[PDB]
Structure formats: structure tokens, C-alpha cells
Structure 1
Amino acid sequence: MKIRSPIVSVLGHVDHGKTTLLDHIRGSAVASRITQHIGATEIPMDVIEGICGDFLKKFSIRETLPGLFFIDTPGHEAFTTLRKRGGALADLAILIVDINEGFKPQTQEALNILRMYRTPFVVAANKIDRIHGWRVHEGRPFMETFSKQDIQVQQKLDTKVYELVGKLHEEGFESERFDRVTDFASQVSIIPISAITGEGIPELLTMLMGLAQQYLREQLKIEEDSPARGTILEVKEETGLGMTIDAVIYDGILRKDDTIAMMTSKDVISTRIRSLLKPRPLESRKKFQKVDEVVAAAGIKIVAPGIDDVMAGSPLRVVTDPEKVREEILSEIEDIKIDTDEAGVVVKADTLGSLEAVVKILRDMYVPIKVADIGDVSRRDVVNAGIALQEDRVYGAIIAFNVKVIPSAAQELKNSDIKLFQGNVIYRLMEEYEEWVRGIEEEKKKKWMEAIIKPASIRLIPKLVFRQSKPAIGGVEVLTGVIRQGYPLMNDDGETVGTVESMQDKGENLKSASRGQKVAMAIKDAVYGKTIHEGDTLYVDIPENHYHILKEQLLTDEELDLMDKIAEIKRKKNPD
């Protein structure tokens, strides 16, 4: 057993500086007296100590770590592909943000995933050299170069830092410029830097080491002779070689003659490795260097037969026991794909990692999942959604992340009832889904409220009697509420006097009457001069069970007052 290098991802909105930042650290390494990796950069502890001043001396873990293994983040800003059995492949992260631009959509998306997988991170407020009036002091610690700026320049920088603090706060994260942090464990540390200039990088790396000191212990233990465990980051063609796999090994050893298992779009496969390729060491004509093996804390390119359909994000396992590896990979993938008869909600994502991100977020929002898979929305996805709609329209929806819609499914989707949420920003999709369930929720109650007998009051206008009884008919004025056709009416003493049979507003047939409308009303079972009298006030005879639904669904002010009045009336022969 040994302690490996913490794996570090660099996340952030396009053009905010992820690449430039990595190149600068790479450069400080290149300029010294280092193993090369495919898709990653290892910065040895001695290099880190050379960049960080005596500032690093406060962190004892530096004496036990080999260095920091930076991931040169995947294809097209994927980042969720940097996955591992359970959560993130990265042990730590740097969230880069342009200090002059502020938080952008991609920035918030990364922030949500970092919180989701509880990955410790630091925030690098990049491009400080672009603040008006800034005088560059090449590769110097932030504190040193900052103290040489004009006072109004120092102030402009802090204004931008506090804007970031403001944004992180709205997002549920307390934070501060790194040197003003009071609780390192609960506040995000913000390090202002210039990736192009090198300014601030020393405190940036020092804070990363601070994150390691605070959080990383057993997660870094590796068994260097155990069968390698890794994650496939890319599956791509390479000139002269066929399909190739770029992977990061996070535990164990991978040898050039090993058999490795992985997941394809259909099943678990294994392949016997032909070559392990790493970049040329620092006038060979070869683009790569062959290697016999590699030990955890490595990025490698693998050449092996039928890997065309291997999924990016798939676990990579050296095989000892064929059945155990297969079931172990299947169980992992099983919690991400999903296809059952129960629940509802159909999810489609562009990659395994993204699908996993959506599935987890949904599971946190306690939304059941019927289908979750990779690929464009299909007719089958639509049909399955329709099936789930049957037991709550809350599930009659398809959440499609960075995926297109198959024409066949487009047509199937023609008939409504099936809501389609499309987008390349996970938090927005979840935002939209909630405000969607929101409406569906209101549209539901209002619907069952229409079936509830509400409070309403009526006054029998004197001298406007058109029929004494059988259908009793007379002029009426609605006092409070909304009297409806069918409503039961009761005496001032709770005695039932009849039901509203029909109403008419001048020449209009009304099923509902409100305010002080005054209409000719027919009251079934009532008889003038006997059970009802001119001038009387009549009240809706609200049922007990219906009355109780004052709390289970609450209604004008006058209506409220009336409800109490109606309660007082009926309480004359049965309290409550």
C-alpha cells in the first residue's frame, strides 16, 4: 500500500482559463529537473513546493503526497465523464471564473456538480491582469503583486471579488477571498489569479494543498499491486492505430498484457490489451512511448481490439474473475440506466456521466424514474412516458439533456399530455420541471375545489315572487360568495329550505351568481310564505366534510366571515 497523488479537475465556463491555467503550472514543472500522462498532468511535490513559498509549510500532508494529478478535462467540456463508482473521479477541484465576467451558466452547472458529489474545491478568480490599471508582476504570489497595485486598483479587484461572494451566497455557499476566510471547512476560498501571467498561482496551489490537508486521508490509499481500477475518459481513433481508449487509473496496476472489462452501449465486454501508450518523455519520430505498465495515479492510452462501442465514463477493470467483474460493472451501470414498469418520468442524456448527474439530481428531488438512458428521444421513450402519465400527469414528461429528438418520436409527441424538456443546462431543466409540476399542482386543486360547496349568502327580495312553490321562484340578491346551481340552502336556523334549481340574470341563464347580481331564482322544494319568506337571508348548507376543507384548501374575506357565520348557525344543534 501507498498514498497516491490527489486527482484534481479544473472546471469552469468556456474561455475562462482552464487550459491556460494548466499550461502555466505544466510550464513551471517543465522548467525544472517527470512522468508524462495521456489527458493529465502530474506536478511533483517538489515542483509545488518550489512555486508555493513558505506558505505551504503550514500543511503537513505535503510530506506524504507524491504531488497533484491534474486532469486535462475531457473532450468538449464534458466533465461529468470524470466519474467513478459512486461519485467523482476527482478528489479536489478548482472552479475557474473570469473575475471580470462573473458567474455564467456553465459556472453554476459545475458548482452544482461539485456540491452534488461533495468534492472539495477552491475558486480561482482568473484574469486579474485585465482589471483596469493593473500592473503585471510576473509569476508573483497574489498578496505580493496585489500590494503593489494602486489603491483604486486594489479596490476595483475587491469589488469584483465581493460580487463573486454575493453570487456564491445566493447559491448556498459562504465564501471569501482566501486570506480573509475564517472557517476553511465551511467557506469557499477565492484566489484571484492570472493564468496567463502566473500571478496568484502560488496561493492557488497552497489552498489546494489546504483542501488535501483538511479532507484527504484514506481516499488516497492505493494497493499498488492490485488489479487496476480506472475510468475511460475517451474512446477515439488515432492515426496508425485503430480505435483507442484514454483512461485514468485511480487504483492498482495496469500491465500491457492484462485483460480489461468495460461497458459498451449493450453489455459488458473484456479485451486483451495490445499496447499501453504515454506521451514521449520530456529527435524521436514516434508520437508516443510504449510502456510495460502503469500504477494508479496515471493517464494512459490503450490499444486493444473491439472497443468501438465502449462508453466514455465506463469503469475500466483488469480481470481476475470474469463473473465477479461482470456483475460488479453491471450493478454500477444498472443504477444509471434504468427501465422498469413502475414510477414515471423518462430521462435521456447524451453521456453516461450526464445521465448519472440527472438521475441523482432527480433522486434528490424524490422524483420517481421509469426510464433513464443514453441517446436521442425515441418513439419508445414517448410511449413509455404516456404509460406513466396514467398514474399522475406529474410523470407524463421526458427530460432530455443535450440530446436531439428522433423524427419518429417527434410525431408521436404530436399529441400533447406528454411534456418535453430539452436543454444543455441541467439546473434549468430541473428548474423548468419544478415550475411545470407547480402549475400541474394548482390546476389540480382548483379542479377539486370546483367540486366543493363554498360559502355564499342570498337575500329574497321583497315583492318579487313569481311562483309560490313547487318550483318556488323569486327575485334574489347574492350577498356574499358565489351561489351555484345545485347548492343546498338553509334557514337562519340551520333548517334546510331547498336547493338552487336555476337562475336567470335579466335574460341570461346562469349556473353561477356572485356579488350583488340580483337574479330571478328558482328554488326547488322551497315554498314562499311557509319555508321561505320575502326579505329572508338564506345560506349555503355546506356539508360537514366540505366545511373541514377550509384548511385543506383555503377564499375571499367576506367568504371567510360567512364560513364562520354558517358554522355559528349549524352549531345551534350540533357543535362542530
Structure 2
Amino acid sequence: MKIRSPIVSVLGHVDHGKTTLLDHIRGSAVASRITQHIGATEIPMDVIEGICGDFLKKFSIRETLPGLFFIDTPGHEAFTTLRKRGGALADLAILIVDINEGFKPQTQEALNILRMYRTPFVVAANKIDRIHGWRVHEGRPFMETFSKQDIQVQQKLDTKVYELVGKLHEEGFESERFDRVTDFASQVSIIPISAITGEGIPELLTMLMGLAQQYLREQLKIEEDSPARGTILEVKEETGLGMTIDAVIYDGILRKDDTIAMMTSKDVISTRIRSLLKPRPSRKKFQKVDEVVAAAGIKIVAPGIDDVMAGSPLRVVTDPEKVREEILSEIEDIKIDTDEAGVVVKADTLGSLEAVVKILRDMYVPIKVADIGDVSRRDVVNAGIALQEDRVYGAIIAFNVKVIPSAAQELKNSDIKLFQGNVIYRLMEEYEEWVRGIEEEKKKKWMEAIIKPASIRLIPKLVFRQSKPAIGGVEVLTGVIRQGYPLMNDDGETVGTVESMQDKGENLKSASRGQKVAMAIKDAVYGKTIHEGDTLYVDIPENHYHILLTDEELDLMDKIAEIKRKKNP
């Protein structure tokens, strides 16, 4: 066994500097001493100790680590691909943000993923070299270059930093510029840097070493001789070679003659490796190696790929049915396929699928279907089944996936809501803003079937018909009397029901306050059951009442209570 280098991912919005940061870090190592990796950068502990002064001596872990292994976000902002069985592929993360631009959509996406997988991270506030008036001092520690800036320039920098603190606070994260931090364990450290210059990179590495000191122990243990375990980051064509696999190995050893298993869009497969390629420091872009040991980024050339899925687990095979079962189990634990509750989810990768499923669970939103691939006719059908019993579940959440024609058409039918997008948190805000509305609409239709409070007075001298339909001039004292509303006496005695109302020449379904109309009252009779001048009240049902307006309606609301309480509780 051995202790490997922590894996640090670099996340952030398009062009805030993810790649440039790693390229600079690689440059520092090269021009100071380095093994090259595909899509990653390995910086040795002596190089780190060289860049970070004695600021590292307070971290005993420094003595036991081979160094740090950085991995760039693969593809276009594909943060969710950086995963592995037990959680995130990275042990630590750097959330980079243009100090000048601040948080952008992908910054929020990265933050939510980091929060969700509980991965410790620091925030690198990049591009400080572009703050108006900044004077560059090449590769110097942030404290050193900052102290040489004009006071107002320093002030402008701290202002941008406090806007980051404000945003992070709104996100549930307390934070401060790394040197002002109080409890390293609970506050995010923000390190101002310049990926182009090397400014602040010294403190950046020091803080990452701090996080290793604080959180990493058992997770760094690997068995250098075990069959390699890794994750596929990209599957893509390379001139002269065919389809190729870019992968990170986090445990074990991968050899040139190994057989490896992975998932395809259809099933689990295995292939025999032709070669392992790493970037070359003969005008050949790659250099062949015989093997690489855990803590490596490698490009693999093998024949059975083309349909291999980004995000797929990668495993060297020593026992084929034992490995196929392991990979299948890994898939199943994320897939979800019951009948209970509702909500249909589709994503492009196992990692993006896992992320959405995780976020939805934290939102307490039940899921009936969670699977990979374009929205199918089958998906719509299951959503339909869910549509029943809470139209709330009658939805399909599709992350970075397309909709199969047969599905779109068969979907044209309303009642099934579809959310599509390549930004997870945007999909969730959209689903929730949808649920709010649906709920209001249901609650609205909830009132339409409930009798409200209302009061009316029988204008004396305006009796058009005594018996059978009683008809007389009425003035709505308070509330909104309606056609069909029950009416009772000052003693809770039922007098009759409002049969019809007429405002001058217009027939009304409802009458407001001081309206005054000719009203027909079924089952009532003047000079017996009802009397000229009398005030009548609406006889609201017991329960319909429990579901409790203006000051007038409130008073009456209690006025009705008294009346009913007379011959009751």
C-alpha cells in the first residue's frame, strides 16, 4: 500500500481560467526540475515546497504526500463527469472565478455540485492582474504583490473579494480572504490570484495543503499492485488513431496489455488495450508507456470503443463476471426504476444523472424514473402514469439530452411538463417555480367550492312576491352573496336559498357590498319566515367554516359565530 497524491479538480465558469491555471502550475514544475498526464497536471511535493516557503511547515501531511494531482474540468464545463463509485473523483477542489466578473451561471452550478458531494474547496479569485492600476510582480505570493499595490488598488481588490463573500454567504457558505479566515474548517478560503502571472499561486497551494491536512487520510490510500480503477473523462477521435479514451486512474496500476471494462450506451463491455499514451514533453504528439499507477491521467487506444460513455467507471479485468457485476451494481445504485411516487429524470452521463438525482432528493422530490439517454416514448408514458396523483409529478427533467421524435410527438399532449437544459440548478428553479403555480391553481379552485361569509338586508316596501319564490328588494350589507347560498335568521334558523338576483335589468350570479338588487329567495315567505327590514346571514357549513376578508367580513364572521353558538357549542 501507499499514500497517493490528492486529486484536485478545477471548476468554474467558461473562460474564468481553469486550464490556464493548470498550465501555469505545470510550467512552474517543468522549469524547476516531471511526469506528463492527459487532461491533468501532477506537481511533486518538492516543487510545492519550493513555491510555498516556510508557510507549509505547519502542515505535517507535507511529509507523507507525493504531491498534488490536478484535473481540469473535461469537455465544456462537464463538472459532473468527475465522479467515481464512492462519490466525487476529486478529494479537493478549486472553484475559480474571474475576480472582475464575479459569479456567473456555471460558478453557481460548480458550487452546488461541490456542496452536494461535500468536497472541501478553496475559491481562487482569478485575473487580479486585470484590476485597473494593478502592477504585476511575477510569480510572487499574493501578500507580497498586494502590499506593493497603491492603496486604492488594494481597496478595489478587497471590494471585489467582499462581493464574493456576500454571494457565498447567500449560498450558505461563510468565507473570507485566506489570511482573514478564522476557522479554516468552516470558512471557505478565498485566494486572489493571476493564472497568467503566477501571483497568489503560492498561497493557493498552501491553502490546498491546508485542506489536505484537515480532511484527507484514509481516502489517499491505494494498492499500487491492484488492478486499476478509474473514470473515463472523454471518448474522442484523434487523427491517425481511431476513437480514443481519456481517463483518470485513482487506484491501482494500468498496464499496456490489460483488458478493461466500461459501460456503453447499451451494456457493459471489455476490450484489450493496444497502447497507453501520455502527452509528449520524432514529431509525435504522444509518447507510449508500458503502465501508469494510480494517480494518473492517460489516453487509451483500444478497439471496442466508439460507444463508450463519458463518465463510465473504468476497471482492469482479472475476473470478468466479478467485474461486470460490480459495474452493473454501480450503475443500478444510481438508475432508480420503481412505480411508487413520480418524477422522470434523464441525463447524458452516469455522473450527471447522479448529480440531478442527488439534488432532487435534497429537495425531497420523489423519483419514479432516473436513466441515461434521450427522452423516449417510454419515458413519456411513465411520466403520464405519474401525471396521475399530483400533476406535480407529471414532469420530465432532461439534463443535456435530446428528445426522440416519437417521444416529442406523443408528448404534444398537454399535462406533461418538460424541463430541458444543460444547467442543473436552472432546471430545479424551473421545476419549483412550476410547482408553486400548480399549487396556487389547485388552491384557487379550492375556494370556488367554499361558501363565504355574506350579509343582506331586506329593503322594506319592496316586496314583489311573498310565497313560492319570495322576491324582494335586497341590499348586500357585507361580503359577496351568491346564487345558491343558504340563508339563515338572526337565530341561525334556515330561511332559504338565494335563487336569483337582478341588478336593475341585469341578472347576477354574485352581488358585492351595497349593490341593491331584486332577489328571489327559494323556500322563504314574507310575513312568516322572512320579514321586511330583517338582516339575513349566510349559513356557512361547519367544516367550510374551519377553512377560515375585510374588517367588515371579520366582524360578521364572528357575528355569524354568535348566532350559531346560540343553539350550539
TM-score with structure 1 length normalisation?
Answer: 0.95
Q: Which moved further from structure 2: 378-387 or 418-427?
A: 378-387
Q: Equivalent residue of 1:415, what SS? A: coil
Match in the other structure for 1:529: 527
Q: Equivalent residue of 1:278, what SS? A: strand
Match in the other structure for 2:302: 304
Rounded to whole Å, the distance in 2 between the matches of 1:477 and 1:323 is 85
Deviation at 1:56, TM superposition (A): 1.1
Rounded to whole Å, the distance in 2 between the matches of 1:329 and 1:518 is 77
Rounded to whole Å, the distance in 1 between the matches of 2:384 and 2:243 is 39
Kept in 1, the 8 Å contact 2:11–2:72? The answer is no
Match in the other structure for 1:67: 67
Kept in 1, the 8 Å contact 2:77–2:106? The answer is no
Deviation at 1:407, TM superposition (A): 4.0
- Deviation digits for residues 259-316 of structure 1 (CA, Å, limit 9, x no counterpart): 22211111111222232222335xx344333323222111112222212211110111
Q: Which moved further from structure 2: 338-347 or 43-52?
A: 338-347
Superposition RMSD on alpha carbons, in Å? 1.7
Match in the other structure for 1:220: 220
Match in the other structure for 2:35: 35
Match in the other structure for 1:560: 554
Aligned residues: 569
Rounded to whole Å, the distance in 1 between the matches of 2:470 and 2:233 is 82
Q: Equivalent residue of 1:241, what SS? A: coil
Kept in 1, the 8 Å contact 2:270–2:304? The answer is no
Q: Equivalent residue of 1:336, what SS? A: helix
Q: Equivalent residue of 1:180, what SS? A: coil
- Deviation digits for residues 15-42 of structure 1 (CA, Å, limit 9, x no counterpart): 1111111111101100122222222111
Gaps of 5+ in 1: none
Rounded to whole Å, the distance in 1 between the matches of 2:546 and 2:529 is 28
Q: Which moved further from structure 2: 269-278 or 453-462?
A: 269-278
Deviation at 1:339, TM superposition (A): 3.9
- Deviation digits for residues 431-479 of structure 1 (CA, Å, limit 9, x no counterpart): 1111110010011111122111211111111111111122111111112
Deviation at 1:254, TM superposition (A): 1.9
Deviation at 1:196, TM superposition (A): 0.7
- Deviation digits for residues 100-150 of structure 1 (CA, Å, limit 9, x no counterpart): 111111111111111111111101111111111111111100001111111
Rounded to whole Å, the distance in 2 between the matches of 1:474 and 1:175 is 73
Q: Equivalent residue of 2:270, what SS? A: strand
What pairs up with 1:495-534 in 2 under 5 angstroms?
Answer: 495-534=493-532
Rounded to whole Å, the distance in 1 between the matches of 2:416 and 2:69 is 46
Q: Equivalent residue of 1:521, what SS? A: strand
Q: Equivalent residue of 2:179, what SS? A: helix
- Deviation digits for residues 518-565 of structure 1 (CA, Å, limit 9, x no counterpart): 12111111111111111111111111111112xxxx534433322222
Rounded to whole Å, the distance in 2 between the matches of 1:373 and 1:223 is 33
Rounded to whole Å, the distance in 2 between the matches of 1:243 and 1:429 is 32
Rounded to whole Å, the distance in 1 between the matches of 2:263 and 2:556 is 67
Identity %: 100
What pairs up with 1:98-247 in 2 under 5 angstroms?
Answer: 98-247=98-247
Rounded to whole Å, the distance in 1 between the matches of 2:518 and 2:307 is 77
- Deviation digits for residues 152-185 of structure 1 (CA, Å, limit 9, x no counterpart): 1111111111111111111211111110011111
Deviation at 1:362, TM superposition (A): 1.1
Deviation at 1:515, TM superposition (A): 1.7
TM-score with structure 2 length normalisation?
Answer: 0.96
Match in the other structure for 2:269: 269
- Deviation digits for residues 184-234 of structure 1 (CA, Å, limit 9, x no counterpart): 111111111111110100001100111111111111111222222111111
- Deviation digits for residues 67-120 of structure 1 (CA, Å, limit 9, x no counterpart): 000012212221210111142101111111111111111111111111111111
Q: Equivalent residue of 1:179, what SS? A: coil
Gaps of 5+ in 2: none
Deviation at 1:351, TM superposition (A): 2.8
Kept in 1, the 8 Å contact 2:24–2:198? The answer is yes
Rounded to whole Å, the distance in 1 between the matches of 2:360 and 2:449 is 33
Rounded to whole Å, the distance in 2 between the matches of 1:316 and 1:407 is 32
